Structure formats: C-alpha cells, structure tokens
C-alpha cells in the first residue's frame, strides 16, 4: 500500500487527474490521512476543495472502491466541528449517501449509514434535513429481516447508532411521524442480545422520552417499559445508564405512566441503583425517586412497601452532594404529597439527623427544600399533637442550632421560613 | 454526537 502519507498537494494532483484510478488512489490516501487520530487534516482537505469531488465519487456505480473510500473520507470530515459537517452537507452529500444506502455492497451501505449518523448528530437542523431527504425508509429497510442476528455485528451497531442520532436533540424534537416510523424497529433492537445495540437503543428511547407527556406516551404505548426495567437490572453499566435515564424521563410524565413503570417492577431494582458505585447512577436513581414520591399516595406507599425509604435515608446520610440534593427533593415531595402515617414512617426510618446535617451546606436551594420538608413533617405532627416530640428530636441532634443560624442567611425566603419555624415550634 | 472511523 503506497497510499500512506501523501501531501494534500499530491492528493489534489491525483483527484484532478481525470483518471478514475489515479483518483481512487488519491481518495484512498485522503481517507488514510483523515483516519489518523492525531489531528486529521480536515480543514486542509476542505480548503483544497475536495468535498465536491468526493460527493461526485459517491455516485460512481461502476467503481465501488472509490465509493467506499470517498464515503469513509466524508464520514471523517463530517465527524468534526459543525462547520466541517456543514461543509460536507453543502457539497450535496446527504442525497448521495441516501442513494448509497441501497448499495449491494454491505460495507458501502454501512459507511453511508455512518456518514448519515455523523451528519444527523450535528444537531436538530441537519437531523431533520436528513429525515426530509428520505433516509428513514431505506435505513429501516436495511433492518427488515426476520432475525436481527443474521446481520453483521458492526453493521447492526452502526445502524442502531445512526437511528439513535435521528431520535436525538430537542428544540426542535424529531418529527412525530418520524418517531412513529422508527419506534417499532427501535423496540425490536431494544430486544436484541448485543450490549452495544442495547445501549444505543436505550439512549434513543431516552431521547424520545425527554419531552412532553405526548412523547412519553408514544413510547410507553409500545410496551417497552418492562424491557427498560429488565435492562435497568443489567450488569453492563453502559446499558444501565441509558435505561435509568429513560425510566427517569418516563416518571416525569403523568401518574399513569409512573404507575406503568412501577407495575413493571422498577422499584425492585432501586436498592442496587441507590447504592451503585457510580455517582451518576446514584444521582439519577435518586432523581427518579423524587419524581415518584411526587406522585399519588398509593405510589408513595409502593415506594415504602419496597423498603426504599431506608435507602433514601442512606443517600441523604452519605453520598455525592448532588445525589443528596436530589434526595432532599424526593423527601420534600414525599412529605408534601404523603399521608400522616407515611410521614411518621419516614421520621421513624431516621430522616431527621441526615436532614439536619444538610442545613450547613452552601447551596441556598437545598436549604429551602429541607425547610419545606421540615414544615410538612411538622404539619403532620401537629395533626397528632406531637410537635413537642419532633421539636425535642430536632433539638437533640443539633438541628435547632442550624435553624436559628439560618435566620441571618442572606436569602429572603430562607430566613423567612427559618424564623417562622423558630417562632412556631420553639418557644 | 459524532464518531470518526479509524484504520
């Protein structure tokens, strides 16, 4: 292979030669230049004006090697900044790649899938432009096989990643018709036995579930929540992270969607998620819990039945401070929407000491959340003639001191609520 | 977002 380490000048000489095979050699040399991880000369290749020549090569049926080489080079040009991807798009590459998707050579169609994914990954605009050119139909036609296992592993992984990029990005979100067109194949991929396919499919579902309740409902109608929970229980963290993200997105919708999550058995997995060694898994699991303790009282009772209140107490006691803030949110929602029996159970699980210990943080929001939770618990106690007991409890663990110190805190509502508590339950 | 193809 004497196509190693050409100069941009030599490649330009070869591509302008009007000799199909000299052009093929120059295009392979360009591909190898662009395939180096140490600063590929993308900008230099663009300034040479080579993108139109590559795009024209994309359509040379009688020379599949130059098709593959130009597709690879343009894929690696589109893998760069938004301006480089834009240079690829302006050359007319989208329709050429969509036409290549029907190539009878598997590696060329795979490279076209790769390039289209790189393009759509730039953002909403290029995503929707790829959709408008009619990519979804051929992309999904490539997956129209009885058993996904017959497809090549890398082929299927690239197809899944591209389809996931077609579901990515918001403001705007993907077209509803496109999501309806993709979701069946996406579910079939979500039921695949390959870990990377599963991770990309869960990321796609997490993208689709990040939005209004209508999108969440589109996703939930397809009965993917049970599979999402099964994957939530997986050992491969790359699969668990997107599955937890998707469950947390779904529980932000209506209480019926949250209830479908609960029915699928998600809570049973949360004892592990809330003690996960990954800080972000813990944080997102606590964030998901906060969106469940905000729901109905029967759902709070489901949380309690699964014995997850001790795990929230633990997270509040020792965890990354952001996880602790999400836990404070969950506790405040619990107390605001829960019964008196449930608030009493929360206090019995040992919430008061770790809740007080967080009133010395420098985050003003967590102070407000904790004070709101304390006010709710004190209301629940008033409903029992137990305010004296709870005040004694908060005093014996050093909480009264922090509450008093919060009267000089700069923020307004902070000292307002703290002074209210001081004057109302401590006299 | 994007993925470069390496040799």
Author numbering:
A (entry chain E): 71 to 497
B (entry chain B): 361 to 367
Direct quotes from the study:
The MERS-CoV ORF4b protein is a viral accessory protein that functions as an innate immune inhibitor and strongly localizes to the nucleus, despite virus replication occurring exclusively within the cytoplasmic compartment. The MERS-CoV ORF4b protein has been shown to bind preferentially to the nuclear import adapter IMPα3 in infected cells, thereby inhibiting NF-κB-dependent innate immune responses. Here we provide a detailed, structural basis for the interaction between MERS-CoV ORF4b and its innate immune suppression target, the nuclear import adapter IMPα. Our results provide a detailed structural basis that explains how a virus can target the IMPα nuclear import adapter to impair immunity, and illustrate how small mutations in ORF4b, like those found in closely related coronaviruses such as HKU5, change the IMPα binding mechanism.
Since structural data of the binding site of NF-κB on IMPα remains elusive, we tested whether these sites overlapped. We crystallized the well-characterized NLS of p5026 in complex with both IMPα2 and IMPα3, and found that it bound at the major site of both IMPα2 and IMPα3 through highly similar interactions involving p50 residues 361RKRQKM in which Lys362 bound at the P2 site. Overall, there was clear overlap in the binding sites of MERS-CoV ORF4b and NF-κB on both IMPα2 and IMPα3. Our crystal structures confirm that the binding site for the NLS region of p50 is located within the major site of IMPα, overlapping directly with the high-affinity P0 Arg binding site of ORF4b. Structural analysis of the NF-κB component p50 bound to IMPα2 and IMPα3 demonstrates that there is a direct overlap between the binding sites for this host transcription factor component and its competitive ORF4b inhibitor.
